[PDB]
Each structure stands twice: as structure tokens, then as C-alpha cells.
Amino acid sequence: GGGILDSMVEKLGKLQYSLDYDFQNNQLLVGIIQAAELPALDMGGTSDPYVKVFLLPDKKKKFETKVHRKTLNPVFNEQFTFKVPYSELGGKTLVMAVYDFDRFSKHDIIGEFKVPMNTVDFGHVTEEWRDLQSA
């Protein structure tokens, strides 16, 4: 019994994001909207979340949202732009990872998820809530 429970996805919160490829300017648009039900990693029963967003395997443009202090349900409302030609997009993977900011210690990663660009239906704004995966 316990072995199956151990294989289940742990409740590490969820992140809502939006995605759209701008064929007019030839850039991938990423909207980091909000996160919910994040686990508390600090003593004050909270975390200081922020999101790192980038594209594998390149990741030349390492983006980070502002840090939202003392909250397990932050609303980021941030947008990022990756100037990548559509033809180059197929082989890439968009990575989104939520970290707990700490001024004096290594920032702990809370969770992440990946979006293979070849699974994305473009020419339509994609928007979804994704459960964070253990990293």
C-alpha cells in the first residue's frame, strides 16, 4: 500500500501561465500569472516565491519574476519575451521553476515543470494551471 502512496505526486503547489507565439514579431510570449497552494519553507509559515523561466537547451535569456515575500499564493502578473524564430522553436523546452528567496542561504527550489515546444498548439493563446513537480 505505502509504496503506491509514495509514487503519487506530492502537493507542491500550482502555477498558472499563458503562452502565445507572436508570428508578427517572431517572438514567444510567456505570461507568468500566479501560483497557488505553495508549501511553506520558512519559519513564519510562509515562503518568498519567485519564478525562473528559460528555454532548454539554450537558456540564453534567464528570466526571473519579482520576489513576493511571505506568501504562498502570489499573483505575479509578469510577461516575458523570447525572440526565437518559429522554425527554431520545435526543439526547445520551456522550463518554469518556483524558488524560495533567501538573502543569506541558497535559494531552495520549491518545484518545476517543463513545456516541450513541440506539444504546444500555436496560433492560439495557451493558458493552464500546472501542478509543480518535485525537482
Side-chain angles (χ1 to χ4, degrees), residues 23 109 121 134:
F23 292 99
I109 184 178
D121 174 12
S134 186

Side-chain angles (χ1 to χ4, degrees), residues 115-130:
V115 185
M117 292 296 83
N118 61 26
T119 58
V120 183
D121 174 12
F122 288 119
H124 298 92
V125 177
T126 292
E127 187 241 71
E128 55 159 1
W129 275 104
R130 284 289 282 280

Side-chain angles (χ1 to χ4, degrees), residues 63-135:
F63 295 119
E64 300 190 358
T65 64
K66 306 282 188 167
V67 173
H68 290 251
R69 296 189 174 76
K70 288 71 77 176
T71 181
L72 300 177
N73 297 275
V75 169
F76 300 108
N77 277 349
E78 291 201 42
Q79 184 196 339
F80 294 112
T81 298
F82 293 92
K83 303 184 178 184
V84 184
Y86 181 87
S87 48
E88 289 180 25
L89 211 60
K92 304 178 180 307
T93 298
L94 180 69
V95 182
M96 285 169 266
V98 184
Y99 285 79
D100 175 21
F101 175 85
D102 193 318
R103 172 82 59 196
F104 308 108
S105 334
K106 75 170 312 302
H107 302 175
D108 282 334
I109 184 178
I110 289 168
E112 47 101 326
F113 69 82
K114 309 199 171 56
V115 185
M117 292 296 83
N118 61 26
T119 58
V120 183
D121 174 12
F122 288 119
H124 298 92
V125 177
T126 292
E127 187 241 71
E128 55 159 1
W129 275 104
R130 284 289 282 280
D131 293 79
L132 295 174
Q133 303 293 310
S134 186

Side-chain angles (χ1 to χ4, degrees), residues 31-42:
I32 303 302
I33 315 167
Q34 62 180 325
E37 310 165 15
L38 297 175
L41 298 195
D42 303 327

